Amino acid sequence: ARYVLAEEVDFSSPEEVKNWWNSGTWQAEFGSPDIEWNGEVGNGALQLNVKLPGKSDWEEVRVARKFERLSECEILEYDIYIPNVEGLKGRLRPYAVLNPGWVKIGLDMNNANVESAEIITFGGKEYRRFHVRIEFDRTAGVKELHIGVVGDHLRYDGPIFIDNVRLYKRTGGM
Ligand SMILES: OC[C@H]1O[C@H](OC[C@H]2O[C@@H](O[C@H]3[C@H](O)[C@H](O)[C@H](O[C@H]4[C@H](O)[C@H](O)[C@H](O[C@H]5[C@H](O)[C@H](O)[C@H](O)O[C@@H]5CO)O[C@@H]4CO)O[C@@H]3CO[C@H]3O[C@H](CO)[C@H](O)[C@H](O)[C@H]3O)[C@@H](O)[C@@H](O)[C@@H]2O[C@@H]2O[C@H](CO)[C@@H](O)[C@H](O)[C@@H]2O)[C@H](O)[C@@H](O)[C@H]1O
Ligand SMILES: [Ca+2]
Structure with missing residues (x-):
């Protein structure tokens, strides 16, 4: 199977950020503002201001965007950046969800x-x-992608950045 890029979000300006929303949390919080553009990181990136207590293994914040071709796609890639502050400990367990259907x-x-x-x-x-x-x-009916940023005993209050969101679909008619 060969794939082509169907959708890509590089977060070039704040105007892209209006397409993203806070879709909730689990055992974690957003700060205020919850989500904003950052023009230094990634030459433009989505900034999530988070508060992860670091007490449990699933401390989640989630952001989401509509993607018209999502039901055609089969590969998602994206990058997460966290400032290289010394002494950070814990694990990231990032994932995503397709919706409707809450398909993890x-x-x-x-x-x-x-x-x-x-x-x-x-x-x-x-x-x-x-x-x-x-x-x-390929999942029928899905229209929204949720990106789940999950800490596992990762105590952190600060920004986490998302960039280079890429969705691929099969090419060649196959
Ligand atoms: O409503 C339908 C739907 O509801 C629930 O799912 C949606 C909620 O999901 C929550 O997040 C889940 C993750 O999706 C995932 O299931 C995760 O599982 C990990 C687990 O906690 C644990 O860390 C586990 O350890 C494993 C490990 O991973 C390895 O595999 C390892 O090798 O072994 C270890 C030890 O065995 O790993 C699992 C991942 O692989 O759990 C989290 C947290 O789930 C807790 O809370 C849930 C809350 O609903 C539920 O009670 C669950 O049973 C319980 O464990 C969150 O993202 C939450 O926000 C989601 O809820 C949705 O939120 C939006 C916004 O409100 C709404 O639109 C939706 O209506 C819904 O509320 C349930 O899990 C599903 O079955 C399904 O019933
Ligand atoms: Ca970028």
Whole structure:
């Protein structure tokens, strides 16, 4: 199977951010503002201001966007950036959901320990970098993608950034 990029969001300006919403939390909170554009990170990125208590293994904040072709797609990728503050501990368990249907995709497929992470630099500041790649079946009726940013005993009050959201569909008529 060969795939082509069907949709991509790189967060070029605040105008893209209006397409994203806060779809809720579980054992975690957003700060205020909850979601905003950031023009330094990723040359434009989605900034989630989070408060993860670090007490349990599933501390989730979620953001969502409508994607017209979602029902045609089978691969999602995106990046997560967290400032490289020293001494952070815990694991990320990021995933996604297709809706309607609350179809959970990628559960525990992209888990990462923050104490051994790749780094990327933006404006001379370092960020831990986590890539998320999720394969799923074409799912009838889905119109919304929810990205779930999940901490597991990751005590953190600060910004987490999403960038480079990519959706792929099969090509060649197959
Ligand atoms: O309403 C339909 C739907 O409702 C519930 O699902 C939706 C809610 O999901 C919550 O998040 C879930 C995750 O989706 C996922 O299921 C996760 O599972 C992990 C589990 O907690 C644990 O950490 C586990 O440890 C494993 C591990 O992962 C490995 O596999 C390892 O090898 O082994 C270890 C140990 O075995 O891993 C699991 C992942 O692989 O759990 C979380 C938290 O779920 C708790 O809370 C739920 C709340 O509804 C429910 O009570 C669940 O039973 C319980 O465990 C959240 O995202 C929550 O927000 C979702 O609710 C939706 O929210 C939106 C906004 O309000 C609404 O629109 C929806 O109506 C709904 O409320 C349920 O799980 C489903 O079965 C289904 O019934
Ligand atoms: Ca970007």
